[PDB]
Write a protein that binds this DNA or RNA. Structure first.
Lengths: 92, 144, 21, 74, 95, 49, 354, 98, 56
RNA sequence: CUCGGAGCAGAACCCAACCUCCGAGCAGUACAUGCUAAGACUUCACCAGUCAAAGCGAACUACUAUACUCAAUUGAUCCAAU
RNA sequence: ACCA
């Protein structure tokens, strides 16, 4: 449960809840899964390393401009042309 | 006590004819590399220029016209001195670009001939499409 | 294919004028 | 040490490359301009012939090229 | 081939084969391609890449290379960090 | 294989286990003349050990 | 052996006796235009169209819409010609067009377009998006009543719905502002259906909104047969069509047996079939208006699933077929060493009996 | 050289459909051409051969010079080979209920 | 054999990576300087001709 | 005496002759003619030869491009030079 | 210079 978690700094718990919304279930649990090994040791080690990474990433707060992915370009254009059809109120 | 609202089929059927295309995962018709024009697109801009009129179309590779703008429309003709000069080509561009955004079409290919590509009338029609938001290159298909 | 009713559909050299120096 | 020594050499040589490239392109562009100039230079000499073809076509061009060089050297 | 040595009465290995081919424990033999270091300046990158592959031999060659080598060369080895270790056993192979 | 040897009583975990105990329990066969340098403990079976 | 052609062969109508006399396609564009006309004709040989073109039904698509308006072409053509003469009479317009500095007012073009070609452009666009295919099983209608729908975003902005543009579920959190031109005393019905959002049945829809017996254009006064529920496109399930349908009523109709409770948060009750709904009420109802947008998942859809619908948020993935490999051979002759990796299941070293 | 996959045959992506020295068969839908004029399948599915109108690329000078000299009304045809894709690109499957 | 127009020459990276590649040039032409992709530094850099490998 | 094209050998492929003909033992453009990898072709074996999606890097807005034009334009292993 |  990310909220109840106390070993994670409160600010980080807030930031994580945002950048990993899609890993939080209805009850508020952060769920991590690894299936890249036939050994449970090495799958759990990957699960814990993800938790250990989410925290490090949140606390760093990198502001570096990352290279734009291909799938993002399509959204940016699609997003740009949706605020172009946005009208205004007749009587402001 | 099964919740009825959570009765979800294992596979989702999306019948939107644009879903796979809007996801960039649909097949474009590759091939036809000894003939002109290519079919490797989802939508294309086709400009038909006649002796008296200018018509620009956006059609799917399947041949269905999605949106269209011609000087034969009274809505456009009533504001044009001439329906066959550069201004009409530039006007058809500005009109169709708006009808494209209102139809969700943001990307298409334009397949001009070498002379058509260099003409000022077409050079003005494309910049009217660019200014209107429509991008005249399509995103690449995602295979993986 | 020669045995097919569509044989020769790609014939075109008869439509051009013979220009053979 | 060997590793460091090589990495330093590459970073060293790679610090000069941006200037090396533009300098090289400038010399490519300069030579390219002389290719067109040479083409125009040759074309003029033939036009002076005024289609006076025949046997005295090969030596005619050579002597005029040398004559222009003499003025250029001076 | 030497089917019976004069000293030991044993069959001998043809050492030409050992210097050119790799035997995987499953019975496959791996070779380099002939001419992969010859006249690279006249070969296309597609051809050059084909020439750099490690490839398998056919059954006839495998049977031949098995006969030219003794049993020592077919034993399972457990070399540390063998680059080919995972290629020694077959997976999901039917008939 | 190590777990199996212990479960069948062929290797005694109450005492130190080295090469002599694995050979004597017939758990591994070592061939120094074939350039064996000993046993490598490999992970297969780690979940149930 | 020869088989005679099954019909006219190409280029047979060309008289090659007088070859030098015949005119030629001196141009590329001239040839191309004739070629594309030829590609469109029906042929007795096998064509790309046979194998790739959609197989439309032979019977014509039944029209179920309002009758076309009555217009006098004579009076229109006269007035239409008069107007152009006045434009061309002006010397300033000729100069801007000659100097390539003229422009058209897009607002006026749009305004007039709504009343002339709009309806027929909206029909082809709704046909490309497959709405008549799904909503009415192929029956078509021209939306001759311009329908304006806008979702209020913030306080000063509106988000129109048009025909196919994308509106987010957040923008469409709350019911849209709807307006249209209707005479006093007329009765209308407005529904919003998600064509693609259904989570259980592939052939069914969700009824997001239903307003019946609206008096004229006074939408607020219409009976709230089904309350408004924002679009909930599931995550990773792609883009969904959301279609507004404006129906013209011949008389006041009683929809008491099809009304949903307020609030309606049961997906089993919102299951809807527009073709079944209309077929039942076709005798006193006619499609008149059509607008629709596309909607994909956003964060606000989680709130709908968790709070309003009281369920878990379903997540989907686009799964591709597994790659093809030929049957593994005992001796893969000349294949590269990595041929074995194509038939391996695990990357971690195995050890067999040891 | 010649056809490797006749009408109706099932191909996997990459399958060489036909080899040729000159263009007897032209690439159609989902059929790529290699630099030796090799026709190969770009998708998985069924091989079709059809007769289509031939429109060259305007930059192909020799072919364009041909069509410009054709009598008005004369249309060139070539034999094309296609692959009708057998499977969809993918499916949407339920991966979670969170 | 006697006839010879082109020669094979080695082009060494000016990036100091030690990367080399071979190209043909006209024998009478001047020594080649080229902009070529160097995999070690993973970018296009200058290469200078150093040695004639052989005559073609 | 090796390699390509045409006929013989008319239409999937293959097909001999101290058979009939004509050619090749290169030039030219590049300098990503970089890497990598599904699936395939194949000169009746083998060796050798061939084509290629996707991917990574690049390039990039109107025939070109992750596989230049071109028909052949060619030589295994050992060994030698580095 | 010219081993294979």
């Amino acid at each position: 449960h990310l909220a109840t978690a106390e070993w994670i700094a409160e600010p980080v718990r807030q930031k994580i809840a945002i950048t990993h919304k899609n890993k939080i279930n209805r009850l508020g649990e952060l769920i991590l899964t690894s299936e890249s090994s036939r050994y449970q040791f090495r799958n759990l080690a990957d699960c814990l390393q993800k938790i250990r990474d989410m925290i490090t990433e949140a606390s760093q707060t990198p502001k570096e401009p990352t290279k734009e992915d291909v799938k993002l370009h399509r959204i940016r254009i699609e997003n740009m042309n949706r605020e172009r059809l946005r009208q205004k109120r007749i009587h402001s | 006590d099964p919740v009825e609202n959570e009765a979800v089929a294992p596979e989702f059927t999306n019948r939107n004819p644009r879903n796979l295309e809007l996801l960039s995962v649909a097949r474009k018709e590759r091939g036809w590399r000894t003939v002109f024009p290519s079919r490797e697109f989802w939508h294309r801009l086709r400009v038909i220029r006649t002796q008296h009129h200018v018509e620009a179309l956006v059609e799917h590779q399947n041949g269905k016209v999605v949106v269209s703008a011609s000087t034969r429309e009274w809505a456009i003709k009533k504001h044009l001195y001439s329906t066959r000069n550069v201004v009409a080509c530039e006007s058809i561009g500005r009109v169709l670009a708006q009808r494209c955004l209102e139809a969700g079409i943001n990307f298409m290919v334009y397949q001009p001939t070498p002379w058509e590509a260099a003409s000022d009338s077409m050079k003005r029609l494309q910049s009217a499409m660019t200014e209107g938001g429509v991008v005249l290159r399509e995103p690449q298909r995602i295979y993986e | 294919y020669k045995t097919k009713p569509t044989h020769g559909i790609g014939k075109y050299k008869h439509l051009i004028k013979a220009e053979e120096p | 040490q060997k590793r460091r020594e090589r990495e330093q050499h590459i970073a060293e040589c790679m610090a000069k490359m941006p200037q090396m490239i533009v300098n090289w392109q400038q010399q490519q562009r300069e030579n390219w301009e002389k290719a067109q100039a040479d083409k125009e230079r040759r074309a003029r000499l033939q036009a002076e012939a005024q289609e006076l073809l025949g046997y005295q076509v090969d030596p005619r061009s050579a002597r005029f090229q040398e004559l222009l060089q003499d003025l250029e050297k001076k | 081939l030497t089917y019976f040595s004069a000293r030991k009465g044993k069959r001998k290995t043809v050492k030409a084969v050992i210097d050119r081919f790799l035997r995987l424990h499953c019975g496959l033999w791996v070779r380099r391609k002939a001419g992969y270091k010859k006249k690279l300046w006249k070969k296309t990158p597609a051809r050059k890449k084909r020439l750099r592959e490690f490839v398998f031999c056919n059954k006839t060659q495998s049977k031949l290379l098995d006969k030219m080598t003794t049993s020592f060369w077919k034993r399972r080895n457990w070399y540390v960090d063998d680059p080919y270790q995972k290629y020694h056993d077959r997976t999901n192979l039917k008939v | 294989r190590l777990q199996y040897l212990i479960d069948l009583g062929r290797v005694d975990p109450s005492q130190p286990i080295d090469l002599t105990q694995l050979v004597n329990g017939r758990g591994v066969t070592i061939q120094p003349l074939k350039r064996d340098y000993g046993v490598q403990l490999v992970e297969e079976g780690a979940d149930t050990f | 052996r020869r088989t005679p052609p099954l019909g006219p062969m190409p280029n047979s109508d060309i008289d090659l006796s007088n070859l030098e006399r015949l005119e030629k396609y001196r141009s590329f564009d001239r040839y191309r235009r004739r070629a594309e006309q030829e590609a469109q004709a029906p042929h007795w040989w096998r064509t790309y169209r046979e194998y790739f073109g959609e197989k439309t039904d032979p019977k014509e698509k039944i029209d179920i819409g309002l009758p076309p308006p009555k217009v006098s072409r004579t009076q229109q053509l006269l007035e239409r010609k008069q107007a152009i003469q006045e434009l061309r009479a002006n010397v300033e317009e000729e100069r801007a067009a000659r100097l390539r500095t003229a422009s058209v007012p897009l607002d006026a073009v749009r305004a007039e377009w709504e009343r002339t070609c709009g309806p027929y452009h909206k029909q082809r666009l709704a046909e490309y998006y497959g709405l008549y295919r799904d909503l009415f099983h192929g029956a078509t209608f021209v939306p001759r009543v311009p329908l304006h729908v806008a979702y209020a975003v913030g306080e000063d902005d509106l988000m129109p719905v048009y025909c196919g543009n994308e509106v987010t579920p957040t923008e469409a959190a709350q019911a849209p502002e709807v307006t249209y031109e209707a005479e006093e005393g007329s009765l209308w019905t407005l529904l919003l259906t998600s064509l693609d959002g259904h989570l259980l049945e592939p052939d069914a829809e969700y009824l997001h909104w239903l307003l019946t017996n609206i008096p004229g254009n006074r939408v607020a006064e219409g009976q709230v047969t089904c309350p408004y529920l924002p679009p909930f496109p599931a995550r990773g399930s792609g883009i969904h069509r959301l279609a507004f349908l404006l129906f013209k009523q011949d008389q006041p109709i009683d929809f008491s047996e099809d009304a949903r409770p307020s609030p309606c948060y049961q997906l089993a009750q919102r299951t809807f079939r527009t073709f079944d709904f209309y077929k039942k009420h076709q005798e006193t109802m006619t499609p008149a208006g059509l607008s629709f947008f596309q909607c994909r998942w956003d964060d606000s859809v989680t709130y709908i699933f968790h709070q309003l619908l009281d369920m878990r948020e379903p997540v989907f993935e686009f799964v591709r077929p597994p790659p093809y490999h030929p049957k593994q051979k005992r001796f893969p002759h000349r294949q590269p060493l990595r041929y074995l990796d194509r038939y391996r299941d695990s990357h971690e070293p195995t050890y067999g009996i040891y | 050289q010649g056809i490797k996959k006749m009408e109706g045959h099932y191909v996997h992506a990459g399958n060489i459909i036909a080899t040729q020295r000159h263009f007897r068969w032209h690439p159609g839908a989902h059929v790529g051409v290699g630099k030796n004029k090799c026709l190969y399948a770009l998708e998985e599915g069924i091989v079709r051969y059809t007769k289509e109108v031939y429109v060259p690329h305007p930059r192909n000078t020799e072919a364009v010079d041909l069509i410009t000299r054709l009598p008005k009304g004369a249309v060139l045809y070539k034999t094309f080979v296609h692959v009708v894709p057998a499977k969809p690109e993918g499916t949407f499957k339920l991966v979670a209920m969170l | 054999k006697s006839k010879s127009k082109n020669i094979l020459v080695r082009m060494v990276s000016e990036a100091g990576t030690g990367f080399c590649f071979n190209t043909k040039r006209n024998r009478l032409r001047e020594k080649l300087t080229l902009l070529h992709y160097d995999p070690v530094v993973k970018q296009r850099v200058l290469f200078v001709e150093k040695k004639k490998i052989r005559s073609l």
